[PDB]
Amino acid sequence: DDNATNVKAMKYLIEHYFDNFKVDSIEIIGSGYDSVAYLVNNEYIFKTKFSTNKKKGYAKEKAIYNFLNTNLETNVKIPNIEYSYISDELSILGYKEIKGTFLTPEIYSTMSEEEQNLLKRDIASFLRQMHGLDYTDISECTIDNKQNVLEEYILLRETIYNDLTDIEKDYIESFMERLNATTVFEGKKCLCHNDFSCNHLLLDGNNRLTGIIDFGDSGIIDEYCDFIYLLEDSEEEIGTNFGEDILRMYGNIDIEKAKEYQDIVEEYYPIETIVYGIKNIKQEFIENGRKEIYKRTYK
Ligand SMILES: Nc1nc2c(ncn2[C@@H]2O[C@H](COP(=O)(O)OP(=O)(O)O)[C@@H](O)[C@H]2O)c(=O)[nH]1
Ligand SMILES: [Mg+2]
Numbered sequence: 001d002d003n004a005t006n007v008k009a010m011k012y013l014i015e016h017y018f019d020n021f022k023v024d025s026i027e028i029i030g031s032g033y034d035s036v037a038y039l040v041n042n043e044y045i046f047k048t049k050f051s052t053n054k055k056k057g058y059a060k061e062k063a064i065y066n067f068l069n070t071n072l073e074t075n076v077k078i079p080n081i082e083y084s085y086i087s088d089e090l091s092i093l094g095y096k097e098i099k100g101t102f103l104t105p106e107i108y109s110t111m112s113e114e115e116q117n118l119l120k121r122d123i124a125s126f127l128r129q130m131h132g133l134d135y136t137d138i139s140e141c142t143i144d145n146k147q148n149v150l151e152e153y154i155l156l157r158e159t160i161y162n163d164l165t166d167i168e169k170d171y172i173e174s175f176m177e178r179l180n181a182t183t184v185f186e187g188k189k190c191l192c193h194n195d196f197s198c199n200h201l202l203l204d205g206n207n208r209l210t211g212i213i214d215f216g217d218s219g220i221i222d223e224y225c226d227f228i229y230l231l232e233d234s235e236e237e238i239g240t241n242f243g244e245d246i247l248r249m250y251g252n253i254d255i256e257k258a259k260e261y262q263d264i265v266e267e268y269y270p271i272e273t274i275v276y277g278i279k280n281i282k283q284e285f286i287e288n289g290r291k292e293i294y295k296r297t298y299k
């Protein structure tokens, strides 16, 4: 009975690291590929990092919130860290719940054109102000996506690469050649949310943008990065036209380069999956990634 057990250990770690804090209630309310999120005392979110990753950790995430809560002028709420424990082995962040409804393609489609346009304006304006921030104070929070893929590719070569089939290697090797040819990294750098997809966007009762969660991957990176998922054409995101539109509101950006950046990210996804499986040792992720490769080599 796994989640009853998870809630108990988490209740313990919270009251152990944060002495004055007493957990009267606690529930698992969410989980991404990095963290598990707990609603505590029905007002706080405590998340903890279960994924094995060093480049994107809670040290930097806390730095980013604290930077942004200081420099952003906006009525969009973001997490505000009231509790933190950071160690290499285990990290916790605690903050008052960002209250609201999560945006979905489903919610958006039944929105009036009027509510759609103001939401798209809210999103564009939030990205514009954050991408505009002088980022001197968190200058250590730079992210090099190219360099990161290079390291992950090295990890493949040092692990399972040789036991991959030829078309799998062809796939990886084709991506690597493209990654070395593209020009999408040659552009403007700034602070990006960097995981900016529907499921992090909260709406108030008027379907207005009220909150943004999970700056867990944020850093100084390509301006293009915050449009990767807005441009995504899947069933959990609204659609490419949505991203196209927001790119137009945002202004002063090469939409074609943006599209090239998401498409490169998209090509990497099966490899990212296999890498994610290798790092955390969840072999069903290596399977999926490997199977996803075959499903694209046959266009
Ligand atoms: N309603 C609400 N949900 C939250 C809040 N913080 C986290 N969550 C949920 O917890 C999930 C995982 O949190 P997240 O910060 O994205 O962790 P990650 O995806 O693994 O990096 C999110 O997708 C949300 O579902 C919050 O302040 N309010
Ligand atoms: Mg998330």
Ligand SMILES: [Mg+2]
Binding pocket: 032, 034, 195, 214, 215, 216, 217
């Ligand atoms: Mg995250």
